[PDB]
Design a protein around this ligand. Structure first.
Ligand SMILES: O=CCc1ccccc1
Ligand SMILES: O=CCc1ccccc1
Ligand SMILES: [Cu+2]
Ligand SMILES: [Cu+2]
Ligand code: NA
Ligand code: NA
Ligand code: NA
Ligand code: NA
Lengths: 620, 620
């Protein structure tokens, strides 16, 4: 009965039937995106209307369409033809992954390039890479993918160990034309394999690890109702899943005695981008938006008990649409479990003689996705003490190149002849805030140093200052680790027992933001990534920091266009967008498969409660 | 047989007998510090000489002494009388904690101050606080403690809830004189209690938490030999314990196939300081060095199975000396265990069809200490992939004051009338480095942004630069989070298979350093805390960043004096000193007992190995 329930297979089947009866899903059509729409503001009408948004691609070259459908009423609500040269191309389809390699295999220019390198075309894998927007006028309004080649010596071989450098091709996947083949010179193909399950590379496996058994003899402490509603240790929330964003958290709230207190209305990773910093023309165009161009949700892994998720695991299996509108279940795509998290609070008092120890724990909601060479784990954590944390875990195989004779300022060497270009992994968290309700504001908090002098005679004093962000034009903020800069989201109309506004403090990791030159194509298309924090006024259609159609969009969509409205954000329904990321100079230890590295952020209560919220935790 | 073995009760008893026979331990003497000395450089002689350093205090006013003793030979090696006005006072003795309150209870000025506030002297607890060095000429060369008062309504009451503001006293604990009583005015004593085990404050305890069982059916994967030698998943190290520093790690090394490769010779937290930022004369002198003035090791807690340490725990029980030279065991003072640590590496490959998942784990070595209101957990972590991490966990009860009518720029309000002054918790990690041996160097690594132009036509390139620190005068470094600044410790004479020097990269949290004015007393006494990174040339007597005798030392001892030697550190036996800390603006949620907050650092291999070091981890 909840409007935030997961999409069912039955809903997706009805969407397919509605689209087909309306004449919108003929044999040349493909569904490139399908997702449920959140309830509009003011859902207290109980009048549920389950609506779905669909992007429909046409493989014959007709204009694609954006369609909204009501499963509740069985009707098409709206259908709009898209001009893709204006508003952007549709996301990459899974079925286009193979098309690039197949089209190149019959192109005479591609074959001559492989012939010169004595490479058998049957052994050459071609990565299907998003194209961006650069200097090529013929690409405007065409659906382009770019290909980079890797050799597979045999079917189980890791192709990433054998990049074919000096060669790139561009393909129009709708007209099935190879537009350009660029060959800048022969590089030796690196010869060592990267097969991390080969005994000659691993050596004998360790026999020294003894098992760790994690069990819950009485079952977990959380309950799941209505398919995706979680209650755990005073937390309450709904776990959503969207094929673009992946796991989405709705209605995060905390039961403080009598009252269910909202904190966050919607939390998601709304974009991620991996820009490459190698100036070679073979790769200088390379920036993939895994979320906006490829859709990370559709590549979620099925997670195995004991391997991917350890302990007493409750799974969700979300349903998505395939390219023809058939429902497809992602079995065991989301793991949920609680974890011991060490000491929560501890004190032994010299005067009262009381010794006190309590243990912490956290609720984990996670999924893993794989897009080509890269794999990412997305983890949301809820802690007993009111802290909310996100963590991204990056692993997989690094993207490789040749390592040039005489070195490089922009590529790491991993093995003889084998390089890995410098790059970043940058995420955007979209936090639709609801601290004790929807009237919120953001303050920037800096440490203040004070000079020795009158009123500070011993030169020991220090303080803090808070600046309220009142309009969108002043709400684009940068980190400052040296001044301990954080941001507080508060509700000016809801006070704690000390008559102070209740709030939550955002703690960033303060990692570098986008390094590209501000005049670059990627700086225009990924403008969100150039600043640490943005605040906007809530609006239904402002969903992604990069706009709705990221693929081959020429730039400036999303957050820079939103904030130009310069709306009031001082005690209003607001959205925080936090940019955070890893800058990756690959190391030898990242090869041939990379140990996990992590980045994230957290929010801690700041006068939200009237005292510690974990006084009622028992003594184990 | 190992020279790095823990001190035994028998060794401490022999030290006591040697001191007493030499005439150095009469009834007026107290041992203020006693610890084993590490082997000098070049221990390949097998000629073990267990030597102990002792600080001896004299309660009658005679000059204290520093003594070195050989238990191996049963002799006093050296005994030096100390001029404490010159070189500093000895650490605070546990038996002086009560002396401040007792001396004040008979002082007519103190009693009149309590009388005006209608406080029964039998209910007033006085915190024994280190004095620092300020404007009071009569304190030079005297052993001074300062007292701040708190009311206990009954014996099990939390006195911290009832600070007596506006009142402070200074006491000479050797002459037993109250030198000054300062009363700046009557503040109401905050009335609410802070008793976190009182059912009227906690409410009914939660019944919702179900148990988490962590067991190892075949026992742990690590072995302990020789009392304190650990081998775990190719790591090898010795766990030491010192009454000043606490847990110390020696001889950290990694078994890389054939070779045992050193990484860190000695790792410790060599100082910590808590400076207060309240300019009131009642507290503006307040800065306690928990390590150097109080000795955190002697207040280590006995850790309870299931409460403090959960899982399959192996304990060490270190032995220390009491004030008379009797051995005293700290039962279960150190916990050691391994923990599951999520996903180590994962990849599902679209071209080979191979799905691969491995799990991570870490070895934990920890202890907890309590000094007055504050409690700290010190955690060292070793990971499968070669990462070394330190984490400090801060909890306990915040130090309180009155909250003034009309507010404060330097104090947080926690409850009606109850304040908590702003302060920092700043640590110094001393890392005696030995990356593949003792010829090491430090490089500072910054991200380099590049401008769009020739050779970077698309404006996407970025790079990195490394600066070698060659002499101590240029090795005092500051963080720069915006440029992704890290520091690499490498061995220029030991190369990986790519002919690059092997190294480890230090990742800091980039939190603010000391906020006090650079002309303050605390900036002079805690100079280490004003910069993020220092590198020195190794020397036997350069042990602490603040010098040997921190208590009432007038300033400039330790690191600023060491680096003035301007020694060569480019491919030499070097020591890295890393400053890191928390800046604490107390929140309501920190009261009446504070949930843990954390800070730390980590070191990751940087071309130390020839490829990923965890290819031989099996599949669970
Ligand atoms: O992550 C998206 C870029 C990509 C897609 C498919 C193969 C390799 C790389
Ligand atoms: O942490 C050292 C300062 C201190 C010592 C004893 C009681 C309260 C505070
Ligand atoms: Cu990377
Ligand atoms: Cu604190
Ligand atoms: Na356009
Ligand atoms: Na909002
Ligand atoms: Na002096
Ligand atoms: Na060294």
């Amino acid at each position: 009965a909840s409007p935030f329930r997961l999409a069912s297979a039955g809903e997706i089947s009805e969407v397919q039937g509605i689209l087909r009866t309306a004449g919108l899903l003929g044999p040349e059509k493909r569904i490139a995106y399908l997702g449920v729409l959140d309830p509009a503001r003011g859902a207290g009408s109980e009048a549920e209307d389950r609506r779905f948004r669909v992007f429909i691609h046409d493989v014959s070259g007709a204009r694609p369409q954006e369609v909204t459908v009501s499963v509740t009423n069985g009707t098409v609500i709206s259908a709009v033809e898209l001009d893709t040269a204006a508003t952007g191309e549709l996301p990459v389809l899974e079925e286009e992954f193979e098309v690039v390699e197949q089209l190149l295999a019959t192109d005479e220019r591609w074959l001559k390039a492989l012939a010169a390198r004595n490479l058998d075309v049957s052994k050459v894998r071609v990565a299907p890479l998003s194209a961006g927007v650069f200097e090529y006028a013929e690409e405007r309004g065409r659906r382009i993918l770019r290909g980079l080649a890797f050799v597979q010596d045999f079917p189980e071989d890791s192709a990433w160990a054998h990049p074919v450098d000096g060669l790139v091709a561009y393909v129009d996947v709708v007209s099935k034309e190879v537009t350009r083949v660029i060959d800048t010179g022969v590089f030796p193909v690196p010869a060592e394999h990267g097969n991390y399950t080969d005994p000659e590379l691993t050596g004998p496996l360790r026999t020294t690890q003894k098992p760790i058994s994690i069990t819950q003899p009485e079952g977990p402490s959380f309950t799941v109702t209505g398919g995706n509603h979680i209650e755990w240790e005073k937390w309450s929330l709904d776990v959503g899943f969207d094929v673009r964003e992946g796991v989405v958290l709705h209605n995060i709230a905390f039961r403080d005695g009598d009252r269910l207190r909202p904190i966050i209305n919607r939390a998601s990773i709304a974009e991620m981008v991996v820009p490459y910093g190698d100036p070679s023309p073979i790769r200088s165009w390379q920036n993939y938006f895994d979320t906006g161009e490829y859709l990370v949700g559709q590549y979620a892994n099925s997670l195995e008990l004991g391997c991917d998720c350890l302990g007493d695991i409750t799974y969700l299996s979300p349903v998505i649409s395939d390219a023809f509108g058939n429902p497809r279940e992602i079995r065991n795509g989301i793991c949920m479990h609680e974890e011991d998290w060490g000491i929560l609070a501890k004190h032994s008092d010299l005067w009262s003689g009381i010794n006190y120890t309590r243990r912490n724990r956290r609720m984990v909601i996670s999924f893993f996705t794989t897009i080509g060479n890269y794999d990412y784990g997305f983890y949301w954590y809820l802690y007993l003490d009111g802290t909310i944390e996100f963590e991204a875990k990056a692993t997989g195989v690094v993207f490789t190149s040749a390592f040039p004779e005489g070195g490089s300022d922009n590529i790491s060497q991993l093995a003889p002849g084998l390089g890995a270009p410098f790059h970043q992994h940058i995420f955007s968290a979209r936090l639709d805030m609801a601290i004790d309700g929807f009237t919120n504001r953001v303050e920037e908090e800096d440490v203040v140093r004070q000079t020795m002098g009158p009123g500070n005679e011993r030169g020991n004093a220090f303080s803090r200052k808070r600046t309220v962000l009142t309009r969108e034009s002043e709400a684009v903020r940068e980190a400052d680790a040296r001044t301990g800069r954080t941001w507080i989201i508060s509700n000016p109309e809801s006070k704690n027992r000390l008559n102070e506004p209740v709030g939550y403090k955002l703690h960033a990791h303060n990692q570098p933001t986008l390094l590209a030159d501000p005049g670059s194509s990627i700086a225009r298309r990924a403008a969100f990534a150039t600043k640490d924090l943005w605040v906007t006024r809530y609006a239904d259609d402002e969903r992604y920091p990069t706009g709705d159609f990221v693929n081959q969009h020429s730039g400036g969509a999303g957050l820079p266009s939103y904030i130009a409205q310069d709306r009031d954000i001082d005690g209003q329904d607001i959205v925080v967008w936090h940019t955070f990321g890893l800058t990756h100079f690959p190391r030898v230890e990242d090869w041939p498969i990379m140990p996990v590295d992590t980045v994230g952020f957290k929010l801690r209560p700041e006068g939200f409660f009237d005292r510690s919220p974990v006084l009622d935790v028992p003594a184990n």
